[PDB]
DNA sequence: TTAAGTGGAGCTGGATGCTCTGT
DNA sequence: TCCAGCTCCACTTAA
RNA sequence: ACAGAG
């Protein structure tokens, strides 16, 4: 079936190469994941803030140098109607706590949260390959901080069905963290799948990627309207 | 659009001709001028021309860091020594100026007055770029390192070293310096202008338009090493000056199997000699029902091989011009087999014919234009010379 | 910031204020003249050769088009990059061999640059 | 932001003096002596969007309706076409069929 | 992109209204018709093609892309997103292709060429690498699969 | 495969012969069906170039009109009598002394 | 195979138990439906169906 | 009211055919080659001096090719006919004669016709002894008046060599890694030195890497090399947005670190960092001087304008990452097609130079030791190091030149003549740059850009499809031009110098950068006056109307090609919704007034290029034609090439089915030529009886196909019959194979020679 | 203070479809 | 032209 | 080493 045949997905021969190579990173892997609350998206859009990467430059209204007589420092002003609509758990504390994550190594007296909005970073001396005017790095670095969420999961979305007698609200994520992405709260965990079947292998074990690749191989043989017998499968699985 | 206003006159002086010069300072803004700093010395060397500047830095400012001034006024000086110094005192006091040349020719820019009214030109002499000079911590490095420690023909036009001691045998111009504020500034300031009148006719300037398109674009080649005497399909439109007249109309006919007469006056435009030209036209055209026909001679000369394919014939000119004669008796060639008559191939006569005719059913061919007059030019004598010549013309026929 | 124009430029030095100003302006690579009495070929005619006097006229006309009448022929005016930087017009006299003088005359502000109208001097001969 | 020093045009540098904080050259005498609160303000990009999808007028903005799968027959359907292999000389298509949700997708 | 959706939208239900045009007047004992019946050679596309309308030539799943600035061809405007300018073909193989149609259409075809070329030295390779680790496996008469080892 | 061509192809040579023209079959132009329609009919064939067609094995008309005409077939340089090969056992190579 | 100028290889095997290998294992009659899922391949082609 | 429609407007194609276009392309390089590059290489090394004992020297004056003749045994000479060396497995070439001025104690002694090789003398060029002959005059020298030339007879064989399709040289190309960083790069060819510079910004810092450096060096360090010192003025010339700022501040940082403040330190550090092959200083900036972006000019160390280039490409590394349009390798704006001139100019420099050193070593060894009798180098002439080099590359295929590392295998194939189509089809081919590495299906495919150019349906079928391409019917390749009055006129419009500014009127919104083949001219501003008055300029005829000018808005550079090698097409002016072509000019062009020529002076029909006609509006029908329309397309069956020229009402068949017909239609059996039967070739096909075909496009009128065709008129009757006629087979008639049809014949060859050895015995 | 075990980054070596048919 | 192993080098814990 | 064919 190769000679016949060649959110996107990989199809046809390079998809087919992948899954025999077993190679531990694929070209767009997928995360399907179930919730367990699928009824309305006021509740899957919670647990898709939990879960994607967000950036602290995505949700701060203006970054601000300021020099002083006394001091310099960098000041940070959360937009907290952004936060407030997409129903996220950020506030100044937990940025205090998502920065002095591998960056710069700040200390935490150095950062303060003088209201609910503001974050100041006061800089010290890198005293390693780096002048004191280091605030030039700091204004270009801590923008891409993460604050909230899976630093692998590049993004994810919110997918709906097609029945009439229902209506459930699924999540395919595209990410390379099956881990992560089972072990939120509000997703169900139990249904929650990959593509790549080597963090199926990592975190399932060794007989769910043998399922992963039977359904993978299958799936990727259908899309493109072959029929192989499942025992073919079977065995080179 | 009429010129409304201002009606500008633009003048010209030289009396600054060979003095005036353009600093421009690539790295300060039109702000900050350097009107109020004092200058020290001012370098120069008139050919090849480089300048040198030196300015004078303030200590008793706040913007003056005295803790890095002396250390950088230790590190570039000796301890002591004052002998030749950079610096005069214990302080980093002057910032010298290095100038780079912009372009070769200076000929084509000019400085523009403009009082009210009129408008004075100058040329300039050079155009030079000031930026700030980093020398001083090169003198510093090198302190700091004497502190610790039957040839080939040759390229030295191409190689720094002889270049920099090209430069070096020329010797220093030293010069006062005057600011903006003396009364010098604006002693100097009128020789910009020049003495004239309001009104005065330039004995030069005096080129056409079109002289002075020719001057700015000249023309790729003087002349060419060959003379085109054109066999080849050269262009009969342009009016090619090396090539005569009649050769144009040789050229011509020789595309144009037959035109019409009027088209020579459309096509020379009445400045031709449109009288006297007959002796030549005559001798490469001939009028026959009302229109032009090309005369045998320009086509083939008599030791030309077949032009087509299919079995090879020689030339032999008086069979066509037996052809284009029946033309000029009947009204056409009106019978199916003159080529067993004129014993020729058909692929001779049918191909001939086919650049001056379209073919009708039948009776041979059509004649592609229609019968225009005869007696437009005045010429009586010709409409009975020309019976007198096609008669001679039909009794050499009559030999063969 | 807009882009002023040359109508717009000798309008605010002539009309708005009396004060004179040193322009910068550019030439074509030869004016349209002959060398007088220079020993020469056709070659290029600039202001090094011409004499003192009237040398032409400037015509403003009537919606912004600006000419240089510079004999028969009328050249084009246009206003060329504005620079913002400083530029200072300086003479340099040699009146020593070893000595002389240098004086400031003003500082440029603006840069005109002057070109042939290639439209009309083709449209007297065409080609 | 770059500022250039007045003098040689090198880039300043912040760094604290004995009675200010001073933007300072690296390779000359000038310091300016910050006395007045100085800021830059960066203005970053938002997180715009939302973005849920997947609705079934999403999936059902294509031509076709009201044809025959070979399968289940229904009404509605999402088709494709496809040519992009000339050493399949036949033509190429594959549906979808979801009236009654019963989902073949066949060549 | 939603205008992309929305022109393909209403470019497509012309090949269908088309299509099923031409497919309710044709007599029985037409031959396209009598050969896409009963499935021998041809489909019900193939004849809506070569009567009816030639549909959108699509390229990589999606209209035809620019190849000079902001345009597919110097013919049609810049920034135009018109059917006609992107590679949609209203005329049938039976009236006759325009120069821009035939060269939509032949870039559309191209790649049906060239993804049949590439096609053999792309899969070759996997089916050599499947044969030399699968060719050892046996049903053996204990009904179990072993390897040779 | 979808050749209109060659069926319009057979067509115009058909109405070409009959009346002794070579109709163009240019691209993006040429000589279109609806003229070609014309000299068909005037010289008593169909206008649509199916003809009236006696099998010649049982001597009974056929059912269906079959479509008749002149197309310009081309000889390739593929022939058989090049390519026909077989070996019982013959020379072989020195190094490995397989055929 | 398309008969468009094609060419096709031909064996002779050279040995009985090459030919009873060939026969009940190879023939054509005993590969009716491919071995991937069991669909018939020597079946009617076009002018046959039609 | 509807437009009119001028009737006789295809005229303008056969008025074309004359004189450009089909294989003309070859001719009009080889003669090129022959009339001026053959000086222009003798110019470059016309004196020569041993290196021992001076006041000796060779001097070369003039060179001249000539005739074609053979050397024979008697040391009888005579002219050649190319099919004489057809038959007898010759080559067919002219004596390359050089005259020159040696010294032999007597300071001045000169020769005149001094032979020192054998050129190859392509057919119907210049030289050829078939040009400008009647056709009755071909059948004495036993040669088809059809046969299109274009082609090498080295030792029998007909060698023709291709088509080449290279990259444009001197152009930034910015592209994206394998990484996924946006770089930039240009290969900087000129005539002595090709190298490629880079531009990689690894670390969000921008490095400059080459082949010379073993570590790529920042960029403000190179900078502070070229002799520019402010950081300021540095930031001036990249640009002075603040998103550009800050994009490139972190160089300035790095730069910092380091304690480079000064040109000396700069050129310290880069020294330091060379490959090594006054060191420190002078091998830094003789590397920056002449080997680091090579095509720009410096002329007395004065780095300026080098600076503006590399701040140039700087700043499209930035604006490039901001948003993605990096440039693509297959707008054909961007290639360059190399003719049989281009290479054989190369050749013959390579073969020349090391005969002036094999001569210069000969006279080394024979001057300081030997003889106190003047000898001279007349006696040391062999002209065999010329014409077995030429022959061998020509025959052969293989273009291993040293001095240039081109190592180019396969430009030479045989001229096929199994049909006339497969003859004419191979003068057209255009081989390309990559050659099959991989399968890299993205210039495999149909780009828009060969609009016209190339043909979009013949192709061959198989690991080539797409990579072997075929010219149009009506295209044109430009040759190198003058570049005399471009710069003269440019420098009239209004475009100021480069030098008499700083780097920040180049972030301005209304300055424009006006480029000549990668070199910079300076600034501009109102481009439009200067787009329209070069077009009027070139109109007139004052520049030579292949030199193309274009304008791209969003870099905000003005491109002028004077180059050679680039495609070019015509079309008509059109002005204000008329064209410009009128019926009178077309009954004038029948009747014999005017030529084309007449046509490109009075402002009718200008060549338009690939990049040019970006910016043009073309109207393909006088119907389609609005208010912006610049253009009118002359004859649309142009686009398709000279194999697809034969198909019947190609555009209602599929699309493969015209690229299965290319493919099938060369190797039909049909006629060679006129002299078919006096050739004697390894295999030729012929048919018995051929017939012009009976439905023929106006290209087989324009390539003479109906004068010697390949194919016979079958009746067909359209049925299923018998059962034998499942997939693609076809029944015959048996009565009319008898009778004629189909009958081929075969020919075939057997050669066989007999040779005199060294020692005195012979075969017999 | 430093011994040590483990991350991340650069270098290296391997591979890229099957046959006939001719020069 | 794309991709696994091998080796070098900073970066914490732990004494 | 190049061109073909399926
Ligand atoms: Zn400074
Ligand atoms: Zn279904």
């Known amino acids: 079936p190769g000679t016949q045949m060649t959110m996107n997905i990989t199809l046809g021969v390079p998809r087919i190469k992948e899954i025999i190579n077993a190679s531990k990173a694929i070209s767009t892997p997928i995360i399907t994941a179930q919730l367990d609350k699928d009824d309305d998206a006021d509740y899957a859009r919670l647990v898709k803030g939990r879960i994607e990467k967000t950036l602290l430059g995505e949700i701060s209204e203006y970054i601000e140098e300021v020099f002083l007589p006394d001091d310099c420092f960098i000041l940070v002003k959360l937009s907290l109607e952004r936060i407030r609509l997409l129903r996220l758990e950020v506030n100044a504390e937990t940025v205090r706590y998502s920065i002095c994550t591998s960056k710069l190594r700040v200390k935490p007296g150095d950062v303060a949260v003088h209201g609910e909005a503001v974050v100041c970073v006061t800089p010290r001396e890198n005293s390693k390959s780096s002048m004191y005017y280091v605030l030039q790095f700091l204004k270009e670095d801590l923008p891409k901080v993460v604050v909230q969420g899976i630093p692998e999961v590049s993004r994810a979305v919110i997918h709906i069905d097609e029945q009439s007698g229902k209506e459930k609200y699924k999540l395919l994520v595209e990410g390379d963290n099956l881990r992560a992405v089972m072990a939120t709260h509000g997703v169900k965990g139990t249904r929650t799948t990959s593509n790549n079947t080597y963090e199926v292998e990592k975190t399932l074990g060794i007989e769910a990627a043998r399922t992963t690749i039977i359904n993978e191989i299958q799936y990727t043989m259908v899309n493109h309207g072959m029929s192989i017998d499942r025992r073919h499968v079977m065995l080179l699985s | 659009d009429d010129p409304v206003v201002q009606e500008i006159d633009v003048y010209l002086a030289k009396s600054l001709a060979e003095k005036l010069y353009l600093f421009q300072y690539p790295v300060r803004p039109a702000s900050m001028t350097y009107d109020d700093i004092p200058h020290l010395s001012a370098k120069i060397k008139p050919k090849q021309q480089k300048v040198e500047l030196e300015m004078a830095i303030d200590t008793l400012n706040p913007n003056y860091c005295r803790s890095k001034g002396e250390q950088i006024a230790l590190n570039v000086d000796g301890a002591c020594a004052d002998e030749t110094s950079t610096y005069s005192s214990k302080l980093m006091d002057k910032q010298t100026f290095c100038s780079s040349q912009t372009t070769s020719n200076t000929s084509r820019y000019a400085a523009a007055l403009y009082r009210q009214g009129e408008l004075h030109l100058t040329p300039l002499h050079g155009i030079l770029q000031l930026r700030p000079s980093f020398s001083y911590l090169d003198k510093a490095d090198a302190k700091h390192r004497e502190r610790e420690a039957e040839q080939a023909r040759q390229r030295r036009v191409q190689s720094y070293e002889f270049l920099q001691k090209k430069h070096a045998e020329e010797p220093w111009v030293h010069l006062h310096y005057y600011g903006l504020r003396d009364s010098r500034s604006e002693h100097e300031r009128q020789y910009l202008l020049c003495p004239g009148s309001s009104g005065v006719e330039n004995t030069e300037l005096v080129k056409s338009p079109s002289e002075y398109l020719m001057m700015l674009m000249p023309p790729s080649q003087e002349e060419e090493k060959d003379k085109p005497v054109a066999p080849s399909n050269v262009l009969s439109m342009a009016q090619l000056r090396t090539l005569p007249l009649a050769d144009q109309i040789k050229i011509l006919m020789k595309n144009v199997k037959v035109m019409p007469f009027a088209n020579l006056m459309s096509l020379l435009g009445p400045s031709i000699d449109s009288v006297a030209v007959l002796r030549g036209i005559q001798k490469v055209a001939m009028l026959v029902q009302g229109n032009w026909v090309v005369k045998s001679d320009i086509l083939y000369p008599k030791d030309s091989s077949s032009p087509h394919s299919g079995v090879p014939a020689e030339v032999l000119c008086r069979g066509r011009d037996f052809v284009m004669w029946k033309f000029t008796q009947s009204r056409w060639v009106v019978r199916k087999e003159v080529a067993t008559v004129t014993k020729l191939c058909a692929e001779d006569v049918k191909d001939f014919l086919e650049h001056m005719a379209v073919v009708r059913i039948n009776k041979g061919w059509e004649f592609i234009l229609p019968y225009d007059g005869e007696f437009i030019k005045k010429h009586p004598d010709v409409v009975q010379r020309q019976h007198m010549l096609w008669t001679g013309i039909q009794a050499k026929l009559e030999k063969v | ?127 | 932001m770059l500022l250039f020093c007045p003098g040689c045009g090198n880039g300043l540098i912040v760094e604290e003096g004995q009675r200010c904080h001073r933007f300072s050259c690296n390779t000359c005498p000038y310091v300016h002596n910050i006395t007045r609160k100085v800021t830059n303000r960066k203005y970053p990009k938002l997180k715009e969007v939302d973005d849920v999808l997947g609705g079934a007028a999403a999936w059902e903005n294509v031509d076709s309706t009201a044809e025959s799968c070979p399968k289940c027959e229904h009404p509605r359907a999402y088709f494709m076409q496809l040519q992009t292999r000339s050493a399949d000389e036949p033509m190429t298509t594959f549906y979808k069929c979801c009236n009654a949700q019963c989902g073949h997708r066949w060549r | 992109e939603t205008l992309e959706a929305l022109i393909l939208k209403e470019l497509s239900v012309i090949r269908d209204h088309a299509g099923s045009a031409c497919l309710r007047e044709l007599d029985k004992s037409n031959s396209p018709l009598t050969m896409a019946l009963c499935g021998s050679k041809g489909s019900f596309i193939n004849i809506s093609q070569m009567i009816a309308c030639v549909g959108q030539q699509a390229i990589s799943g999606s209209r035809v892309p620019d190849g000079f600035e902001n345009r597919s061809l110097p013919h049609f405007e810049k920034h135009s997103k018109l059917p006609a300018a992107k590679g949609f073909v209203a005329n049938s193989f039976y009236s006759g292709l325009t120069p821009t149609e035939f060269f939509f259409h032949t870039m559309a075809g191209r790649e049906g060429l060239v993804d049949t070329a590439v096609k053999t030295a792309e899969t070759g390779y996997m089916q050599r690498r499947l044969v030399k680790s699968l060719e050892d496996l046996c049903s053996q008469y204990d009904l179990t699969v072993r390897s040779s080892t | 495969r979808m050749t209109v061509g060659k069926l319009i192809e057979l067509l115009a040579g058909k109405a070409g012969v009959l009346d002794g023209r070579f109709h163009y079959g240019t691209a993006f132009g040429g000589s279109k069906v609806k003229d070609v329609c014309e000299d068909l009919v005037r010289h008593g064939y169909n206008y649509l170039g199916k003809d009236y067609v006696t099998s010649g094995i049982t001597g009974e008309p056929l059912e269906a009109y079959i479509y008749f005409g002149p197309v310009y077939y081309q000889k390739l340089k593929h022939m058989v009598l090049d390519k026909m090969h077989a070996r019982a056992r013959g020379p072989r190579a020195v190094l490995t002394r397989q055929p | 195979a398309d008969f468009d100028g094609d060419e096709m290889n031909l064996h002779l095997p050279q040995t009985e138990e090459a030919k009873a290998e060939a026969l009940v294992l190879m023939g054509t009659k005993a590969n009716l439906v491919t071995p991937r899922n069991g669909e018939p391949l020597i079946a009617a082609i076009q002018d046959f169906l039609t | 009211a509807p437009i009119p429609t001028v009737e006789e407007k295809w005229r303008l194609l056969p008025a074309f055919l004359k004189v450009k276009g089909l294989v003309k392309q070859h001719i009009d390089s080889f003669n090129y080659f022959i009339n001026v590059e053959i000086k222009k290489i003798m110019k470059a090394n016309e004196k020569v001096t041993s290196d021992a004992d001076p006041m000796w020297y060779l001097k070369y004056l003039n060179i001249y090719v000539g005739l074609p003749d053979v050397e024979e045994s008697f040391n009888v000479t005579r002219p050649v006919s190319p099919h004489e060396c057809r038959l007898r497995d010759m080559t067919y070439s002219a004596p390359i004669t050089v005259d020159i001025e040696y010294t032999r104690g007597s300071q001045r002694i000169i020769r005149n016709a001094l032979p020192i090789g054998r050129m190859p003398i392509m057919l119907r060029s210049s030289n050829c002894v078939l040009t400008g002959k009647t056709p009755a005059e071909f059948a004495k020298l036993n040669e088809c008046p059809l046969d299109p030339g274009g082609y090498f007879i080295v030792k029998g064989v007909e060698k023709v060599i291709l088509i080449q399709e290279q990259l444009s040289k001197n152009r930034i190309i910015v592209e994206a890694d394998r990484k996924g960083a946006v770089g930039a790069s240009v290969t900087s060819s000129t005539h002595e030195k090709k190298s490629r510079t880079n531009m990689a910004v690894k670390q969000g810092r921008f490095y400059l890497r080459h082949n010379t450096l073993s570590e790529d060096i920042p960029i403000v360090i190179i900078f502070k090399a070229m002799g520019v010192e402010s950081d300021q003025e540095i930031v001036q010339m990249i640009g002075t947005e603040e998103h550009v700022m800050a994009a490139f501040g972190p160089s300035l940082e790095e730069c910092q670190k380091a304690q480079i403040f000064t040109q000396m330190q700069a050129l310290k550090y880069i020294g330091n960092k060379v490959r090594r092959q006054k060191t420190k200083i002078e091998e830094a900036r003789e590397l920056l001087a002449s080997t680091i972006l090579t095509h720009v000019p410096v002329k007395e160390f004065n780095f300026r304008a080098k600076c503006i280039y590399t701040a140039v490409m700087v700043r499209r590394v930035i604006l490039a990452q901001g948003d993605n349009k990096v440039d693509d390798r297959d707008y054909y704006g961007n290639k360059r097609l190399e003719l049989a001139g281009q290479l054989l100019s190369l050749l013959f420099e390579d073969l020349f130079k090391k005969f002036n050193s094999e001569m210069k070593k000969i006279a080394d060894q024979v001057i300081p030791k030997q003889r106190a009798a003047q000898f001279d180098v007349v006696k040391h002439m062999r002209q065999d190091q010329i014409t077995n080099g030429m022959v061998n590359a020509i025959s052969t295929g293989n273009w291993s030149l040293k001095r240039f590392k081109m190592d180019r295998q396969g430009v030479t194939q045989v001229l096929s003549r199994l049909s006339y189509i497969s003859a004419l089809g191979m003068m057209t081919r255009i081989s390309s740059q990559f050659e099959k590495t991989r399968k890299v299906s993205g210039p495999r495919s149909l780009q828009p850009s060969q609009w016209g150019m190339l043909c979009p349906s013949d192709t061959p079928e198989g690991e080539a499809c797409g990579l072997v391409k075929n010219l149009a019917l009506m295209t044109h390749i430009t040759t190198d031009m003058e570049d005399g009055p471009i710069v003269k006129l440019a420098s009239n419009l209004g475009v100021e110098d480069v030098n008499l500014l700083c780097g920040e009127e180049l972030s301005y919104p209304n300055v424009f950068l006006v480029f000549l083949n990668g070199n910079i001219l300076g600034v501009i501003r109102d481009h439009k006056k200067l787009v329209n008055t070069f077009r009027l300029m070139r109109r007139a005829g004052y520049i030579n109307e292949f030199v193309s000018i274009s304008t791209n808005l969003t870099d905000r550079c003005v491109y002028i090609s004077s180059d050679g090698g680039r495609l070019c097409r015509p079309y008509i002016i059109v002005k204000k919704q008329k064209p410009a072509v009128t019926n009178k000019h077309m009954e004038e062009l029948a009747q014999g007034y005017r030529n084309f020529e007449d046509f490109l002076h009075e402002s009718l029909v200008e060549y338009l290029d690939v990049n040019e006609e970006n910016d043009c509006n073309i109207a393909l029908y006088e119907h389609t034609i609005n208010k912006d329309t610049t253009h009118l397309e002359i004859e649309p069956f142009t686009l398709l090439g000279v194999c697809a020229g034969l198909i019947p009402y190609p555009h209602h068949n599929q699309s493969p089915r015209n690229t299965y017909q290319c493919a099938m239609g060369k190797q039909a059996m049909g006629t060679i030529g006129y002299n078919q039967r006096n050739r004697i070739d390894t295999l030729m096909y012929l048919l018995a009886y051929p017939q012009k075909p009976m439905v023929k496009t106006k290209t087989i009128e324009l390539i003479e196909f109906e004068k010697l065709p390949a194919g016979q008129n079958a009746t067909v009757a359209v049925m299923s019959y018998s059962g034998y006629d499942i997939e693609d087979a076809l029944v015959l008639n048996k009565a009319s194979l008898d009778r004629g049809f189909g009958r081929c014949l075969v020919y075939k060859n057997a050669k066989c020679t007999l040779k005199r050895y060294t020692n005195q015995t012979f075969d017999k």
Do not use: W, Y
Not at chain 3, 77 to 103: I, P
């Open chain 3, 1 to 127: 910031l807009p882009k002023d124009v040359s109508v717009a430029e000798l309008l605010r030095e002539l009309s708005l204020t009396k004060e004179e100003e040193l322009l910068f302006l550019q030439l074509p690579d030869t004016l349209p003249g002959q060398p007088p009495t220079q020993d020469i070929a056709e070659n290029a005619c600039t202001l090094a050769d011409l004499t003192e006097g009237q040398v032409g006229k400037l015509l403003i006309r009537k919606s912004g088009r600006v000419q240089l009448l510079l004999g028969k022929v009328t050249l084009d005016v246009t206003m060329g990059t504005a620079c913002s930087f400083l530029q200072e017009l300086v003479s340099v006299g040699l009146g020593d061999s070893r000595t002389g003088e240098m004086t400031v005359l003003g500082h440029v502000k603006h840069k005109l640059v002057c070109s042939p109208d290639f439209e009309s001097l083709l449209d007297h001969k065409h080609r």
